Design a protein around this nucleic acid. Structure first.
Lengths: 101, 138, 72, 144, 189, 143, 55
RNA sequence: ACGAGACUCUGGCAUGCUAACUAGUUACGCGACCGGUCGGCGUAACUUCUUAGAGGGACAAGUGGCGUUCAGCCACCCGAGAUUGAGCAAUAACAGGUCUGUGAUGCCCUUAGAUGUCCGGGGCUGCACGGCGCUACACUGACUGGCUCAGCGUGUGCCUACCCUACGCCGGCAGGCGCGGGUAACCCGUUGAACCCCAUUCGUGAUGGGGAUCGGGGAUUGCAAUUAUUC
C-alpha cells in the first residue's frame, strides 16, 4: 500500500507554511516522490455580538472572525519514513492528522 | 499546443483548449453564430465574418465558458476570440504580423481588457444595506 | 363608455396591411393602423403572420420599439 | 450519416427530436401534463402536450452535459427561483410520484435512461443511440 | 475596412466645426468597433469627460433606478436604437440623430445667476459639447416620457419623440418645461 | 373573424358577468368554474384545439367545462373553484343553479350565520380569520 | 413531590437546559460553534480562544 | 510625545505556484465524428477559470495647465491598475448605561403556599400602513419554446436524547415510514440568489400592479398553538 494522506491545519498561516515546507523537504530530501501541497479553502468562522453588556447605547457590533487554514498532502512511501517525519517536533499551533489509507 | 492567454470576464468559468482546426465557441451547446441571448448577436458576429469565414480555421479552440448572465458570456466570447487570435499570431507567425494584428485588435479595443478589484460591497450594522440606515432624521 | 371591441382577429385588423402602409417613406404600421380605432397589437400580429408565410423564419417579437420590414 | 455530439446544437437536437415525434404522432397524446402541479413551485404548470418529449429531452441534455449528475439540479436548470405564497419558500421537493409513474411507461423507448447502478453516465451504447437519434433529427423540422 | 453589412456605411459623419476636438475625442486612438466594451471610467482620475454621444444616449435615459440589473438591457437598447432609427430614417441612425437634435434643443439652457439663483435662470451660451449631450439627454428623457406611459400604440413613439424634440408639438411635458426655460432665456434678451 | 352582425358583446349564457374587452385567462375566469390551471387540465383531458377563440363563443363549450367542474372526481384532479367542496348540502360535488335566490343558493352562508361561525363571518368582509397583531389590522373588512 | 409529580413528561429541552459555561448565566448564550458562552464572557475571552477582530 | 497617516483585513489584476483524486488535461488503451468519453485505472510536465488557497508589482524610466512653480490641485496622447469598504482609533469628560453577564466586588434583610417546584388560562395582543423590513395607472414588465448558470455560510452525540439531509413509498401533496450519505471543497449540492426570444398571452388600462384570505387529499419530531411554526 502506498496511499497516505496527511492533513495539516492551523489558524496561523506562517506556521502552516513552515510545517508544510518541512514535510515537503523531508519527503524530497530522501529519494521519494511526493505530491504538491493541496491547498483547501480557508474556513472563516464569523460571530457577531453587541459590544455593550447591557441595553443602552448605539447598536454597535463586534464581528469576530476566525480563519482555519487546512492542507492535504499525498504520500506514496513506506510507513516507517512517514512515522519518522511525523515525529519531528512540529511547530506549535498546528494540528496534524496522519492517515494511512 | 499552448498559447496561455485564456478569456475571462467578470467571474465566469472559462476554458480555452487549443488544437488545430476551425475556431468555434460553444455556449450552452449553442455555437458562436447561434448564441444564447439571441439579442446581442450582431455585436459579436461583426468582427470576424466580414473579413473571412475561413479566418478561424487556423487552430480549433474548445471554448466552453459556463457563463451565466448575458454580459458574462457575451463579450467574453469576443475576449476569447481576440486573445486566441493575438496569441496564436504572436507565438506562431512572426513579429511583424504580431504588430499588425495587434494594431487591428487594439483599434478594436483601446484599453479595457483588465479591471480593478471591485464587486458588490459589504453590509454594515445599523442599517438594512451597505450605505443605508433606519428611520430618517429630517 | 363601454367601447365596442372585438376579441379576436378581424377584417379591420387585416385592413390595409399591404395597400398603403408599406408604400410610405416611414414604414411603421402602428399609428396609421391605430387611426382605424381597432386594436393595433393584433394588427401587428396579423402583419407579422402574413410576413412569416414560411420562406423566412420570423418568430421573434422583441420589445415595443421593434423594427418592421422594408417593402417599398 | 450524422456528426458527433460536440458540434451538434444540443437545444436544436432536442427541439428537432421533439418536432419529429410530434409530427409523427406515433405515441398517444399524454394527458398527465397538467393534471398535477408538476412540482411544488408551479402555480400554472407547462401546457406543451409534448412536455413528455420536451422535458425528457431536457433531462437527457442534463444527463449528457455532465454524465454523473446528482438529481435535484434538474429543477435548478429547468426550474426557476420559486416565490410561493405569503411565506418565503426555498429549494425542496417537486412532484416526484407522477414523474416516476410516467417514467415507468417511458422506459423501453430509449428516451430517458435509468441505469443499474443508479444515476447517469456517458453510456457508450446509449451514447451511440443518442448520436444516431441526433443524426436522424439532423434532417428534421426547423433549420431550413 | 469595417462597415455595416453590404448596404450601410458609417463614414458619413463630418460636421467640421473645429470645436468638437477638445471634449469629443476622435483625435488619436479613441476609436472602437464596439458601441460599448465595459468601461472602467469610474476608477480613472475623471478620465470619463471625453465620452462620445452614443454612450451618453446609452447612460442618460433610465427613469429612477428601475432599469439596472443587467447591462444586457443597455447594450440591447443601444442596438435597437441603432436599428429603429435606421428604420425610421432610412440612413445612418446616428447621423440623423445629430441632424434632428442640433436643429433644436438647448439654444440657451437652464443655468443659474451669479453665486446663487433659483428665482429665474440665465440665457447661457451652451457649449457645443454640453449642448449636444443635453440635447441627447432631452431626446432620451422624451423617449422615456412618450414611448413610456403612452396612450397610443408604441411602434412610432420614436417618430413622435423626434417630432416633439425638434418640430415642437404640444405633446411632451419635457418640451413644455423647456418652453418655459426658453421663455426665461428670452426674458434675458 | 368579425362578420357584419352582432358581436358577442353582452349576452346571457349562464347568468355570469363578462364583457368582450379583456383577453384570455380573464374571459374564461369570468365564469367561476373555468380558468387558470383547471382550464389547462380541461383543455388537456378533452383534447381541445388551441386556436379556438372566445370572441364568438358557443354555449356548449362553456357548459361542458362546467359539467367537468361538477364532476372532477374521475379525472383525479383537485375539485377546486368550488366554495362548496366537502361542505354541507352536497352528498357528492353537486351543482346548484340560478340567481336571485342567493340566500337559498348559498345557504352555506346561512348555515354559517345560524351557527354564527367567525369563519363564516369572514365571508361578506375582506379580512383575515386569524387576525394579526394589533397594527394595520381591522382595516380588513372595509364595507 | 420530590420524585412523584415532576418528571412525567419531556421537558429536558427548554432554555433552562442551558447556561453560560463560565458564569452559569442563562441569558444571551452563544450556541454557534459550540463554545457555549454568553455575549460578554465571549467578548472577554475571544482573544484567548482564537477569535480576532479583523472585519 | 499621543492622535491623523503609515498599519491590518478586504475587494470586476497576474501566464511563476518544478500545484491539486473535488476542476479540464500534450504525446497512453477506449472513441461514430468535420488529436478529444486518459474528469468514467491514474499524466509523474499541467492550471486557464477553482482553490482570493501560498510567494507580486506598475503614479510618476509620464504629459498639459493652475499654484510663490513649493506644498499641492484639475484634465490626459509608450500605458491592467489613477478616492473599495471596514478594523484599530488620542487628551480631557458624563454623577450617560450596566450591581437583573459574572466565583468582579463595597454597604443588607430574619420567621410562612420566599423572588428558586407546582400558574388548565393568560402577561405588551384592551389598537385606524400624516418605529426596519411593503403598492410603480406600465414593452424598463409576462407561466421552463433559453439556463454547458453569475453566489455568504451552517450541519450528528465528549457532558446530552435534541444536526444537515439526498432517495423510494404512503402520494396528484403538509405530515408519516424505510434502508443511505455527511465531523464536511468528499453528503445535502452543479444550494431552485432573474427566466433575456419570454409557444394561458396587453387598448383608451374599475379587471396580473391586491386578487380589502378560510372552503376544500388531510391539518405538528414539543405538556400549552384561544392574536398563532398549523400547511
Amino acid at each position: 500500500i502506498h496511499r497516505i494522506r496527511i492533513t495539516l491545519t492551523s489558524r496561523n498561516v506562517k506556521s502552516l507554511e513552515k510545517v508544510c515546507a518541512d514535510l515537503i523537504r523531508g519527503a524530497k530530501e530522501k529519494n521519494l516522490k511526493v505530491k504538491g501541497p493541496v491547498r483547501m479553502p480557508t474556513k472563516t468562522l464569523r460571530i457577531t455580538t453587541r459590544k455593550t453588556p447591557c441595553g443602552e447605547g448605539s447598536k454597535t457590533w463586534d464581528r469576530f472572525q476566525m480563519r482555519i487554514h487546512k492542507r492535504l498532502i499525498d504520500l506514496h512511501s513506506p510507513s516507517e519514513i512517514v512515522k519518522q517525519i511525523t515525529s519531528i517536533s512540529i511547530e506549535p499551533g498546528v494540528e496534524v492528522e496522519v492517515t494511512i489509507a | 499546443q499552448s498559447v496561455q492567454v485564456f478569456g475571462r470576464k467578470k467571474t465566469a468559468t472559462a476554458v480555452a483548449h487549443c488544437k488545430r482546426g476551425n475556431g468555434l465557441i460553444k455556449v450552452n451547446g449553442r455555437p458562436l453564430e447561434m448564441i444564447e441571448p439571441r439579442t446581442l448577436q450582431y455585436k459579436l458576429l461583426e468582427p470576424v465574418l466580414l473579413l473571412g469565414k475561413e479566418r478561424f480555421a487556423g487552430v480549433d479552440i474548445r471554448v466552453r465558458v459556463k457563463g451565466g448572465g448575458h454580459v458574462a458570456q457575451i463579450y467574453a466570447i469576443r475576449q476569447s476570440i481576440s486573445k486566441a487570435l493575438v496569441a496564436y499570431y504572436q507565438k506562431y507567425v512572426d513579429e511583424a504580423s504580431k504588430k499588425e494584428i495587434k494594431d487591428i485588435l487594439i483599434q478594436y479595443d483601446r484599453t479595457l481588457l483588465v479591471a480593478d478589484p471591485r464587486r458588490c460591497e459589504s453590509k454594515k450594522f445599523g442599517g438594512p444595506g451597505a450605505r443605508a440606515r433606519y428611520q430618517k432624521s429630517y | 363608455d363601454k367601447l365596442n371591441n372585438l376579441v379576436l382577429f378581424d377584417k379591420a385588423t387585416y385592413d390595409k396591411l399591404c395597400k398603403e402602409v408599406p408604400n410610405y417613406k416611414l414604414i411603421t404600421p402602428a399609428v396609421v393602423s391605430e387611426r382605424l380605432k381597432i386594436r393595433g397589437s393584433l394588427a401587428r400580429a396579423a402583419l407579422q403572420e402574413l410576413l412569416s408565410k414560411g420562406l423566412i423564419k420570423l418568430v421573434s417579437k422583441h420589445r415595443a420599439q421593434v423594427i418592421y420590414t422594408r417593402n417599398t | 450519416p450524422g456528426v458527433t455530439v460536440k458540434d451538434v446544437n444540443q437545444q436544436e437536437f432536442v427541439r428537432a427530436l421533439a418536432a419529429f415525434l410530434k409530427k409523427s404522432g406515433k405515441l398517444k397524446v399524454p394527458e398527465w401534463v397538467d393534471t398535477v402541479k408538476l412540482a411544488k413551485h408551479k402555480e400554472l404548470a407547462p401546457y406543451d402536450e409534448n412536455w413528455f418529449y420536451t422535458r425528457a429531452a431536457s433531462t437527457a441534455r442534463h444527463l449528457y452535459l455532465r454524465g454523473g449528475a446528482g438529481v435535484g439540479s434538474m429543477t435548478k436548470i429547468y426550474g426557476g427561483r420559486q416565490r410561493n405564497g405569503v411565506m418565503p419558500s426555498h429549494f425542496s421537493r417537486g412532484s416526484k410520484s407522477v414523474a416516476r409513474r410516467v417514467l415507468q411507461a417511458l422506459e423501453g423507448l430509449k428516451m430517458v435512461e435509468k441505469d443499474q447502478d443508479g444515476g447517469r453516465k456517458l453510456t457508450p451504447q446509449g451514447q451511440r443511440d443518442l448520436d444516431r437519434i441526433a443524426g436522424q433529427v439532423a434532417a428534421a423540422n426547423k433549420k431550413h | 475596412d469595417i462597415k455595416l453589412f453590404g448596404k450601410w456605411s458609417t463614414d458619413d459623419v463630418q460636421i467640421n466645426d473645429i470645436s468638437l476636438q477638445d471634449y469629443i475625442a476622435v483625435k488619436e486612438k479613441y476609436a472602437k468597433y464596439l458601441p460599448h466594451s465595459a468601461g472602467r471610467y469610474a476608477a480613472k482620475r475623471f478620465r470619463k469627460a471625453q465620452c462620445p454621444i452614443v454612450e451618453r444616449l446609452t447612460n442618460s435615459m433610465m427613469m429612477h433606478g428601475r432599469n439596472n440589473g443587467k447591462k444586457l438591457m443597455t447594450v440591447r437598447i443601444v442596438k435597437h436604437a441603432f436599428e429603429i432609427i435606421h428604420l425610421l430614417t432610412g440612413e445612418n441612425p446616428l447621423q440623423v440623430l445629430v441632424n434632428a437634435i442640433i436643429n433644436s434643443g438647448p439654444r440657451e439652457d437652464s443655468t443659474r445667476i451669479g453665486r446663487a439663483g433659483t428665482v429665474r435662470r440665465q440665457a447661457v451660451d451652451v457649449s457645443p459639447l454640453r449642448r449636444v449631450n443635453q440635447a441627447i439627454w432631452l431626446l432620451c428623457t422624451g423617449a422615456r416620457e412618450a414611448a413610456f406611459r403612452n396612450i397610443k400604440t408604441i411602434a412610432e413613439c420614436l417618430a413622435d419623440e423626434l417630432i416633439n424634440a425638434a418640430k415642437g408639438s404640444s405633446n411632451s411635458y419635457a418640451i413644455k418645461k423647456k418652453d418655459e426655460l426658453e421663455r426665461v432665456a428670452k426674458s434675458n434678451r | 373573424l368579425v362578420i357584419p352582425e352582432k358581436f358577442q358583446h353582452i349576452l346571457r349564457v349562464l347568468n355570469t358577468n363578462i364583457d368582450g374587452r379583456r383577453k384570455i385567462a380573464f374571459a374564461i375566469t369570468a365564469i367561476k368554474g373555468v380558468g387558470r390551471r383547471y382550464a389547462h387540465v380541461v383543455l388537456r383531458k378533452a383534447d381541445i384545439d388551441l386556436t379556438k377563440r372566445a370572441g364568438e363563443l358557443t354555449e356548449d363549450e362553456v357548459e361542458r367545462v362546467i359539467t367537468i367542474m361538477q364532476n372532477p372526481r374521475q379525472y383525479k384532479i383537485p375539485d377546486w373553484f368550488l366554495n362548496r367542496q366537502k361542505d354541507v348540502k352536497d352528498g357528492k360535488y353537486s351543482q346548484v343553479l340560478a340567481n336571485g335566490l342567493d340566500n337559498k343558493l348559498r345557504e352555506d352562508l346561512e348555515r354559517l350565520k345560524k351557527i354564527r361561525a367567525h369563519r363564516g363571518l369572514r365571508h361578506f368582509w375582506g379580512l383575515r380569520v386569524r387576525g394579526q397583531h394589533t397594527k394595520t389590522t381591522g382595516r380588513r373588512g372595509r364595507t | 413531590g420530590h420524585q412523584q409529580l415532576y418528571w412525567s413528561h419531556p421537558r429536558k429541552f427548554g432554555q433552562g437546559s442551558r447556561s453560560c459555561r463560565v458564569c452559569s448565566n442563562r441569558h444571551g448564550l452563544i450556541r454557534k460553534y459550540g463554545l457555549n458562552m454568553c455575549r460578554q464572557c465571549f467578548r472577554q475571552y475571544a482573544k484567548d480562544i482564537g477569535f480576532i477582530k479583523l472585519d
